[PDB]
Design a protein. Structure first.
Lengths: 179, 179, 179, 179, 179, 179, 179, 179
């Protein structure tokens, strides 16, 4: 019940991302009070997706992650039925209105290119773009097309390494990298 | 009195657009509690006009729809008496400060090009631009000049199809497409 | 998915009570999109408990309903370990700091005194006070001790009958009284 | 169109009362831009009713005036079906939870006791309380039961005479007292 | 131009009282940048009047000080024409709705009873109550009727001595007590 | 005291511009309650200057109009002592950080080019730019350099003609054009 | 650096009390990141003092704790120089305007009566009231005069035991009770 | 204790910069009530750094100044470990995401080029950019690369000279230039 990682996650991310991660995890039958590593992972993924969507230019991205399952899908059908893009098999995170493709955002604790592989065998859809970030500071995207400019992606890497430092300062990073 | 479409409209659009649609419909002698399809249509038209005006660049559009009749006209006379453009016969929805022309925004449930025809015989003014959106996801504008960029108009189409899905999920879309 | 009762509940109660009812129902494995009658019941119970706690005088009641299970219990242990009152078997709704007893608030669709019976066999604790409200406008409390004054309890009855009227106007009240 | 009374009413009362008076007058087919005296009268009546309801003690009054017709009635049926009081023939302004009776609030430009007469022949219901205020500073209530204390009713009289002074300073009071 | 007392007054009182004192002093042809002692005196008088009006019970006092001359008078005529109290010769600060009399609030740097004398020869009206506060911590009122309870008047004295300490800490109190 | 123009000005412009105009007029010994035409003129000039400063790009203009005399000057000395531009003889309205020159904004009721003449004989400084707007919808600037783009200046003309229409609807425009 | 108690304190108390405790501890040369037990103690003491001051009736208490040393003293001199009460030797927490005495509030982890002893030998002033609360749920005050009513003091005890439970759930309570 | 410079600093800068300067000075063992010149210097440096960071384009700069020492460093390690830039020896003020270098911002009272020298011997790191501003209105940066455009840096110079004027008007500038 009383885990250091829970209090650290509640002290690290803003209340909105914490509430959204709690909702998304309870929806799939996972307890934030027990799966604390998955709690931190969901919060980090949500914040990274939000910074990514903010890195655009007003009407650039459509936020899919953070919506309810029935609602997050409804936007996918509306995007597909209006542009003509094939419907993805699994829920993505964003839709680039400038590139006419969905974006899958990953945040891994291992090296940058095995998580892309893991996300590539699962997807195997079509034009769905994959963008991977790592806590080490590296990144990797489809066709080397990193979608955003260098200044926006640098902020995501900096914030990612900031969370890694705060976890290690509380001896919680070693258990985070395992699972 | 107790109609599903009324509660759906109050749950779908934000309170400001709902209040503006109620005002605009009561002004013309129409009850939102009875003409629920017209209520949803007015709300959708208002939201589409607002997204259109937001798709500009700060000082780009002058919002005519959503103003009171005497006030909405007063801005039309001020626009005409300062630029020299001929006064339109019927109230438009916007004025493009970059193109020196008024814009008429339509949202139809039929195919995109019969509503443009219907709006073309009524207008027949001069340089008044016509821009039509459909729930199917298509669009059509005067001289193929769609005024806004592709990214802004895609958001309008996506949101339009989102409302169509929520209506069909409540079995209210079939009655909406009829009237 | 698209139920009239869902939109009516979202249009009737404020967003905070709706969110709290969604949380409380998802916690116990119940879907607000499917168990719409239970959704309305949870919202009504929450609002009645809140009006009851507001009917006091600043430092009068301690709100138990609407808190998370682990948190709502933690306040019960703190109340018991500081006053000396025996710990209740099941989660109550309030604690009267003026009467040194917990309060169980019920809102039933049947007559007022069978729900009290149903709540009396389940409880059978000790000094836990029971207060029952009905949609018909009647009420019943332990030892005829209605805790609050007449003016506060009249507001709860009035609001309860207001919800019953809005449900019947949408033909949703008959299905509500059944389950 | 451009009437001094309209601008004075918009400068005198707060925007909420002005909007509520506009809604209530448009509901009954009356134009605030044309019936400016009736506009000021509706605004004054609304503000007096609000100060009256504020003169209570938290859970004392139920505000009927300012609600929509279908909604304002729904609260009357809920009050009657829960307390047992006979349903009034015409819409009142408040309900005293402490006295178990409805209150009719009048604000007249003539002497205090002819408007009470006018309101007494129309009503003739039962326990519906009548409370009359005048711009001259006098008042009159049923059974000499003025419901509120002296300090609250003095504020209403003071504010009423303040509006009369501002009208006379703009030469609008003489036309107000006629109609 | 650059006076220590000006910056101290802007750092001591809240922006609203500072703005009201600036307005009241510019209305009578006095510069806050030059008459800095009168600036501090006006701010202190305004704050004392506000704490006094707050010391009541909701509908107790009518605030006269801090209003514009034409507006502050208009409330005096409305109070007199509705209660029957004789109109005062000079603008007072409050009106006690519970005692049916106006209140004149003074804040002096000399002893408490010479300022009352000075305010008594000027007034000499009728039932206008006089209440005097001093920076030394003493007070004096008409007929020993101090209107408010002991707890509210103690706060005013405490705050008054707090300002005297902050002035002396900046060597500005000696010049304040002179003028 | 009770002038139609006063209530119209309070109903037309936002409270901030009204307060700033009241301050600026009381500073120079002019009463807004008496010099109502000058009141409307000051409000219009302030709003036009604000729209002009907003027409830039974040760090483009430095707002001089609307500041207190001693403060509005202090910014002029700071601008001159840091850029090297000669100090103007009379207070301007803006400073263009992109053009290294002050801007004088005029709003006249006569034709556009006699007010520029009137403002040119008074100024006769150096690089101080003059920009004139008229209620008729025309404009005129130094060296035909209109500083802003066409879309921003069109909004100012439209709003100017909107105020002219509202004045004429209340029969206040004829007296406005005289003085 | 990374202590569980720090994150727990930041997750438990509101940001204002946390900031005030950080300020008060840095003022006396103590690090909240190192003296985490003292951090939690300062936060708990501040919250208890705030609930105590809120337990009064508007103008009842004067808050001394939470102010800066020079400021917190300045209010003590102002209270003494206006009421005549002897100046205390050490900074208290409140001043009861109804009882004409200062209040010292203690929150101990041991039994209730040894901390009162410890606070009695240190004080030994005069009429300075001592009120002690414990995490076990007991209390003790001077002359058995508990100042507040039973309902307000019960809330403090309940909240105190809530913090003790959350500490023990994170295995931080055992180290808290030691120091 | 009562210094003119303290009140001037509290009247000049916004409360946030004042609080941040108080925190930063108390962290290094310096009293704002005593080291008033250093207080004004810290406030000016903070405001200049904030205007500099605002002069960018959304995701351009990372604010280092104004953060706590342990936190301000944590961002430096995250920036270095993600971009590959060498870690600076002393805490900088910003990081330019567009130029891949840290920025050191200085505000001196002497001539612009001796403070750059003083900051150059201390630094002597690598690609750390130095940008110096002066109260006289001049500036100097590394490689004549002033990072921002001319319009943003002109605002900083103007505001700097505004503070110098307000200090001299209160006879506080001469003592400021000495230390
Ligand atoms: C309002 C919400 C829209 C976005 C919310 C998302 C989160 C944003 C938080 C905001 C506040 N900001 C922006 C400035 C700083 C800050 O704190 N954050 C948090 C991490 C970084 C960030 O940018 N963003 C991004 C753009 C602006 C905004 O608000 N979300 C949430 C999920 C779905 C969605 O669209 N909506 C719209 C309707 C439903 C809803 O929840
Ligand atoms: C304030 C209003 C100006 C606009 C209002 C219009 C609606 C806007 C709602 C706003 C809030 N936003 C913007 C971000 C999200 C949001 O929720 N929406 C709702 C649908 C999408 C949208 O953009 N917009 C658009 C630009 C910003 C703004 O506010 N309107 C209303 C009718 C006349 C008018 O000009 N005004 C000005 C004075 C009178 C008045 O009512
Ligand atoms: C803030 C919350 C405290 C209460 C919330 C509860 C609900 C209240 C809504 C408020 C707003 N009001 C009051 C005026 C009108 C209104 O809309 N409503 C809604 C129905 C009627 C009512 O009174 N009340 C009641 C007293 C004031 C208040 O806010 N709750 C929610 C569950 C736990 C709890 O204690 N807290 C405290 C910390 C955690 C939290 O969520
Ligand atoms: C919120 C509303 C509740 C009341 C509104 C009514 C008006 C009140 C304005 C408020 C703000 N205050 C109170 C302090 C000063 C002020 O400006 N005024 C204006 C004139 C004097 C006054 O007291 N009052 C009175 C009690 C508090 C309140 O808000 N109303 C409006 C009609 C129906 C109703 O119940 N509600 C509830 C849900 C629907 C709605 O509109
Ligand atoms: C709103 C205003 C009403 C009062 C303003 C007066 C000042 C009050 C400031 C308020 C905020 N509070 C109250 C809590 C703390 C605080 O900071 N202060 C400042 C000093 C102490 C105090 O209580 N008070 C007192 C009662 C509540 C209120 O707001 N005033 C100002 C002059 C005329 C008037 O009636 N109004 C009404 C319409 C016009 C206007 O300006
Ligand atoms: C805050 C103020 C800065 C500006 C104020 C000026 C007025 C602006 C009103 C604002 C709100 N907006 C902007 C969106 C709509 C709106 O209503 N309006 C009113 C008319 C049109 C307009 O844009 N503007 C313009 C830029 C943003 C802003 O706020 N002013 C006032 C005089 C001096 C000054 O610099 N400041 C700064 C410190 C002192 C002060 O008063
Ligand atoms: C504003 C402040 C006044 C008090 C602050 C104190 C804290 C209060 C927090 C408030 C918000 N509330 C009240 C409702 C819930 C809530 O969250 N809390 C936190 C714990 C419980 C509580 O009641 N209280 C108590 C009365 C109202 C108030 O605000 N304080 C802080 C130290 C000095 C002081 O007087 N002031 C005045 C000027 C300087 C300053 O900081
Ligand atoms: C929120 C804060 C972010 C920045 C704060 C900084 C100060 C800014 C004040 C803001 C309000 N504005 C902007 C418009 C006018 C105004 O008054 N000012 C004051 C001087 C000029 C200025 O632009 N800025 C600059 C960009 C926007 C913003 O807010 N800061 C403070 C130190 C660390 C930091 O990043 N944060 C983020 C999380 C922690 C925190 O404190
Ligand atoms: C059961 O897990 C969840 C599943 C979902 C549905 C959609 N899922 C994602 O969008 C997603 N989710 C993770 C990720 C990885 C590890 C732990 C937690 C989340 N990584 C990603 O790259 C990614 O696109 C939402 C929230 C969840 O918690
Ligand atoms: C009586 O109807 C209304 C009329 C008006 C006046 C101006 N009208 C429009 O601006 C408009 N209105 C619809 C439309 C179509 C069907 C139903 C409702 C609205 N479509 C459009 O393209 C369009 O330009 C305002 C609100 C109304 O409700
Ligand atoms: C006494 O008058 C005022 C003077 C001032 C000082 C600076 N003045 C202007 O900045 C200004 N003022 C008007 C103008 C013209 C007619 C009536 C009112 C204002 N026109 C302009 O073009 C213009 O630059 C400020 C506010 C005033 O009211
Ligand atoms: C150095 O310590 C502090 C001292 C001060 C000055 C005034 N002190 C109190 O007002 C106080 N302080 C604690 C207490 C006990 C243990 C740890 C922390 C605080 N207990 C009490 O009963 C109590 O009246 C303010 C904040 C501090 O952190
Ligand atoms: C002890 O002093 C402080 C030191 C610090 C740590 C980082 N320091 C700066 O970032 C900094 N500080 C000054 C400066 C110069 C004179 C007086 C005050 C500050 N000038 C600069 O250019 C500059 O980069 C933060 C706040 C301080 O008060
Ligand atoms: N065990 C985790 C490791 C991946 C990660 O932490 O990103 C899965 O697979
Ligand atoms: N009956 C409607 C159909 C058009 C529409 O729904 O858009 C008219 O004509
Ligand atoms: N079937 C429900 C009826 C009770 C109620 O609706 O309150 C149970 O038992
Ligand atoms: N002619 C109006 C007069 C009553 C009133 O003004 O109050 C009716 O009858
Ligand atoms: N010279 C001032 C003294 C009175 C006061 O300061 O209160 C007058 O008379
Ligand atoms: N009589 C005014 C006319 C100019 C104007 O109205 O703009 C001056 O000269
Ligand atoms: N060692 C601490 C114990 C007291 C307490 O924790 O309250 C002192 O003495
Ligand atoms: N004595 C100060 C002067 C530098 C400055 O004021 O900027 C150091 O060195
Ligand atoms: Mn996803
Ligand atoms: Mn993803
Ligand atoms: Mn239209
Ligand atoms: Mn249209
Ligand atoms: Mn219950
Ligand atoms: Mn009435
Ligand atoms: Mn006085
Ligand atoms: Mn000017
Ligand atoms: Mn000008
Ligand atoms: Mn204490
Ligand atoms: Mn620095
Ligand atoms: Mn620096």
């Amino acid at each position: 019940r009383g885990s250091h990682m829970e209090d650290f996650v509640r002290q690290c991310f803003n209340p909105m991302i914490v509430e959204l991660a709690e909702k998304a995890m309870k929806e799939y039958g996972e307890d934030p009070k027990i799966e604390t590593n998955k709690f931190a992972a969901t919060c980090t993924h949500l914040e990274v997706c939000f910074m990514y969507s903010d890195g655009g230019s007003k009407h650039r991205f459509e936020i899919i992650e953070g919506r309810d399952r029935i609602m997050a899908w409804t936007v996918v059908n509306s995007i597909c039925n209006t542009t003509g893009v094939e419907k993805p098999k699994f829920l993505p995170d964003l839709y680039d209105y400038k590139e006419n493709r969905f974006i899958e955002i990953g945040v891994t604790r291992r090296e940058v290119h095995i998580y892309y592989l893991e996300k590539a065998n699962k997807i195997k859809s079509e034009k769905t773009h994959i963008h991977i970030f790592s806590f080490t500071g590296e990144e990797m995207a489809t066709k080397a097309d990193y979608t955003l400019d260098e200044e926006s992606r640098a902020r995501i890497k900096t914030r990612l390494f900031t969370i890694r430092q705060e976890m290690a300062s509380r001896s919680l990073w070693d258990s985070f990298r395992q699972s």
